[PDB]
C-alpha cells in the first residue's frame, strides 16, 4: 500500500 | 511517563488492527514512514528500517505487537520488559545474538552511561550518492544524538566521514578530511552487530 511503504532496510536502499 | 507509539514492519491490515487497540489506551500514535521520537516502537520483526535503527540509537523500547494486544486487554500499559526485542534470544536464528539483543543492549547501555544516544559526541559528514536522499540516514544519526555537519558548517572537530563507496575512494580524496572514512553499512553495524 502506498500509504504504508516504509523501507525495511535503509542501508540496502543506499547500496542499490 | 508518556506512550508515543510508532509501528514498523506491519502490513496495512495488521497495522489497522493494532491501531484500533490503541483506542483503549491513553497514548499518542504517529503515522509516518519516518522516525518521530517514539517512546515505544512496535516492530513486526528485527529489521533495518529507519524507525528500528533510530529507536535503537536513542535507546527506546522496541517491542512485539503482544505489548499492544495485552495492554489493551488489561486496560493499562503493562511492564515493557517481557515484550522487548532482546528479552529472549533465539539460539537458532538468521540474526546474530548481537542483532537480536540490540534494542535491549542500547536501552540499558544509555541508561547505564547516561549518554543520550549511541552517536553522542559524533560530528558526521555524509558523502551520500547524489542520486539518492540521505534523509533517513540523517534522522537515524540525529536520533542517536550525532551532529550532522552541513556543508555550510565548519569542519572543525569532524569525527566520521560516512560515505557512499567509502572503500573505493582514493587516498587523495580521503585527504580532504582529517577524520576517517566509513561505509554506509558502518551505521547499521555499529548499532546491531559490533561488540563494544
Ligand atoms: Cl505508520
Ligand atoms: Cl563502501
Ligand atoms: Mg537517558
Ligand atoms: Mg584520512
Author numbering:
A (entry chain C): 437 to 452
B (entry chain A): 6 to 201
Give the article text.
To further clarify the roles of Ser442 and 444 phosphorylation in the Rad18-SLF1 interaction, we co-crystallized SLF1tBRCT with the singularly phosphorylated Rad18-pS442 peptide and determined its structure to a resolution of 1.62 Å. The structure and crystal packing of the SLF1tBRCT-Rad18-pS442 complex are very similar to the SLF1tBRCT-Rad18-2P complex. The electron densities for the Rad18-pS442 peptide are weaker compared to electron densities for the Rad18-2P peptide, especially at the N-terminal region where Ser442 and Ser444 reside. Such a difference in density is in line with the reduced affinity of the Rad18-pS442 peptide toward SLF1tBRCT and supports the function of Ser444 phosphorylation in enhancing the Rad18-SLF1tBRCT binding. Electron densities for the Arg448 side chain in the Rad18-pS442 peptide are also weaker, consistent with the lack of Arg448-pS444 interaction in this peptide. The N-terminus of the helix and neighboring region pack against the SLF1 52-55 region, with the pS444 carbonyl and Asp445 amide groups in this region forming hydrogen bonds with the mainchain amide and carbonyl groups of Lys53 in SLF1, respectively. Our binding experiments suggest that Ser442 phosphorylation is critical and sufficient for strong Rad18-SLF1tBRCT association.
Rad18 interacts with the SMC5/6 localization factor 1 (SLF1) to recruit the SMC5/6 complex to DNA damage sites for repair. Previous studies have shown that the tandem BRCA1 C-Terminal (BRCT) domain repeat (tBRCT) at the SLF1 N-terminus (SLF1tBRCT) plays a critical role in the Rad18-SLF1 association.
